[PDB]
Ligand binder design. Structure first.
Ligand SMILES: Cc1cccnc1O
Length: 119
């Protein structure tokens, strides 16, 4: 029932994501010089360095906020891809499966701890 445990759990999961080769396109903001029409398609950029920095600054209140920004990484990749077969999009789908498999217990434990707190 530890209401604060989610934060270290999210730090450890971001460390695994940075070790995965599939994360490399998503570690830093998309390069607008490589992709000059990016902002004509994507309204809100997001990357794993920004997520990590927001967490370490104390600017997430809950793991649900962090999950919403990680899901935006994946939805931007799906919106920007020219093909469902593209290399970078294909990397996003494997990394999304790994994230969703690991975040499920973080969310469940946090929401259980808050219910116990308000009992
Ligand atoms: C998702 C994405 C697609 C194309 C280029 N870079 C990215 O990060």
């Amino acid at each position: 029932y530890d209401i604060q445990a989610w934060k270290k759990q999210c730090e450890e999961l971001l460390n695994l994501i940075f070790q995965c080769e599939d994360s490399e396109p998503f570690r830093q903001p998309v390069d607008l010089l490589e992709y000059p029409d990016y902002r004509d398609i994507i309204d809100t950029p997001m990357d794993f360095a920004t997520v990590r920095e927001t967490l370490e600054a104390g600017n997430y209140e809950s793991p649900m906020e962090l999950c919403k920004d990680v899901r935006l990484i994946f939805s931007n990749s799906k919106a920007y891809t020219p093909s469902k077969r593209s290399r970078i999009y294909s990397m996003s789908l494997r990394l999304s499966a790994f994230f969703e498999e690991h975040i499920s217990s973080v969310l469940s434990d946090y929401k259980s701890a808050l219910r116990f707190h308000k009992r």
